[PDB]
Design a protein around this ligand. Structure first.
Ligand SMILES: *[C@@H]1O[C@H](CO)[C@@H](O)[C@H](O)[C@H]1NC(C)=O
Ligand SMILES: *[C@@H]1O[C@H](CO)[C@@H](O)[C@H](O)[C@H]1NC(C)=O
Ligand SMILES: *[C@@H]1O[C@H](CO)[C@@H](O)[C@H](O)[C@H]1NC(C)=O
Ligand SMILES: *[C@@H]1O[C@H](CO)[C@@H](O)[C@H](O)[C@H]1NC(C)=O
Ligand SMILES: *[C@@H]1O[C@H](CO)[C@@H](O)[C@H](O)[C@H]1NC(C)=O
Ligand SMILES: *[C@@H]1O[C@H](CO)[C@@H](O)[C@H](O)[C@H]1NC(C)=O
Ligand SMILES: *[C@@H]1O[C@H](CO)[C@@H](O)[C@H](O)[C@H]1NC(C)=O
Ligand SMILES: *[C@@H]1O[C@H](CO)[C@@H](O)[C@H](O)[C@H]1NC(C)=O
Ligand SMILES: *[C@@H]1O[C@H](CO)[C@@H](O)[C@H](O)[C@H]1NC(C)=O
Ligand SMILES: *[C@@H]1O[C@H](CO)[C@@H](O)[C@H](O)[C@H]1NC(C)=O
Ligand SMILES: *[C@@H]1O[C@H](CO)[C@@H](O)[C@H](O)[C@H]1NC(C)=O
Ligand SMILES: *[C@@H]1O[C@H](CO)[C@@H](O)[C@H](O)[C@H]1NC(C)=O
Lengths: 135, 135, 135
């Protein structure tokens, strides 16, 4: 990347800011901005690129061959019983949460068994998380 | 990427801002902005690219060959009983949540077994998460 | 990367800021800004790149061959019982949370068994986490 910006409230290249309950009198603002931006990004000069894959099997005997890729999720149990018995009782459940396997962002590239790759891979995440807000 | 911006409230290249309950008197604002932007992004000069895949099998004996790709999700159990028994009781369930496997964003590229890839892969995520808000 | 910025509230290249309950009188602001930015990023000059993979099997005997990739998640149990018995009782559950395997951001590149890779891999994360807020 080049420029990544996270700003909580206010972003301003030039800010003449006046807030509340203010007396703004006899003001002379003079501004000159000569701003130049020149970007040359991701320039490639390749005369020749070779990607080569060769597989040869000759009068061979192969048996019981197994190949398994990544993220092999097998025999997984989630068990969340909730047994609530009541007798002459007062429950005030204002904000009660039961969350299981709650994803927000899942991003995947190039999850393989055999990969031959040339170039650029980029991931950017910006956010504001706020799970529970009980006023 | 080049320019990624996250701004909570206000973005302004030039901001002459006046808020409430303000007296703005005798003001002379003079502004000159000579802004130039030049972008040259992702320029490629290839004289020759070869991607080559060759497979040869000759008088061979192959048996019990197994290939499995990624993300192999097998024999998975989710069990969330909720047994609520009641007897002379008062329940006030204002905001009660039971969430299982709640995704927001799932993004996938190039999830394969064999991949030969040239170029650019880019993922950008911007958001504001707010799961529960109970006033 | 080049420029990564995290700002809590306010970002300003030039800020003439006046807050509340202020008397702003007899002001002469004069500003000249000659700003130049020149970026040359990720320039490659390759005359020749070779990526080569060759596999040869000749009159061989192979048996019981097993290859397993990364992230092999097997035989995993989550057990979170919640047994709440009640008798002449008052419960005030204002903000009670039961969270299991709660992800926010999961990012993956190039999770393979065999990888041949040339170039750039970049990951950027910016956020503000706030799990529980009980006023
Ligand atoms: C504002 O400027 C003018 C001219 O410069 C001047 O006559 C005036 O008195 C100023 N304001 C005050 C409140 O003095
Ligand atoms: C910018 O503006 C001011 C305002 O008077 C001027 O004096 C100056 O010569 C200007 N410069 C450029 C580079 O534009
Ligand atoms: C890429 O193109 C030619 C190839 O040799 C080279 O002379 C030139 O300087 C390169 N371009 C840049 C912007 O560097
Ligand atoms: C391996 O081969 C034997 C017999 O040759 C067979 O019983 C077994 O199931 C095989 N295992 C796999 C994983 O293929
Ligand atoms: C505003 O400016 C004019 C001319 O510069 C001036 O006559 C006037 O008095 C100023 N305002 C005040 C409130 O003084
Ligand atoms: C910008 O505007 C000001 C206003 O008077 C002027 O003096 C200056 O010469 C200008 N410059 C350019 C580069 O436009
Ligand atoms: C790509 O085109 C030619 C090929 O050699 C090269 O001379 C030129 O400089 C390159 N373009 C840029 C913008 O670099
Ligand atoms: C492997 O081969 C044996 C017999 O040769 C067979 O019983 C078994 O099911 C095979 N396993 C697989 C995974 O193909
Ligand atoms: C503001 O400036 C003007 C001219 O410079 C002047 O006459 C005036 O008295 C100033 N304001 C005050 C409150 O003195
Ligand atoms: C910037 O502006 C001031 C304002 O008078 C001027 O004196 C100066 O010559 C300017 N310089 C450039 C480089 O623009
Ligand atoms: C890449 O292109 C040619 C190749 O030799 C080289 O002379 C040139 O200086 C390079 N470009 C840059 C911007 O360095
Ligand atoms: C290995 O081979 C034996 C018999 O040759 C078989 O019983 C066993 O299941 C095989 N194991 C695997 C992992 O393939």
């Amino acid at each position: 990347s080049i420029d990544v910006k996270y700003i909580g409230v206010k972003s301003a290249y030039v800010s003449y800011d006046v807030q509340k309950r203010t007396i703004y009198l006899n003001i002379t603002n003079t501004l000159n901005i000569t701003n130049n931006n020149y970007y040359s990004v991701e320039v490639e000069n390749i005369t020749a690129q070779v990607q080569f894959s060769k597989t040869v099997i000759g009068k061979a005997r192969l048996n019981n061959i197994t190949i398994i890729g990544p993220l092999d999720m097998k025999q997984i149990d989630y068990t969340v019983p909730t047994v609530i018995a009541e007798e002459m009782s007062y429950m005030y459940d204002f904000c009660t949460l039961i969350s299981i396997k709650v994803h927000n962002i899942v991003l995947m590239m190039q999850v393989t068994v055999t990969t031959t790759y040339f170039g650029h891979s980029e991931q950017i995440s910006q956010e504001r998380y706020q799970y529970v807000d009980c006023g």
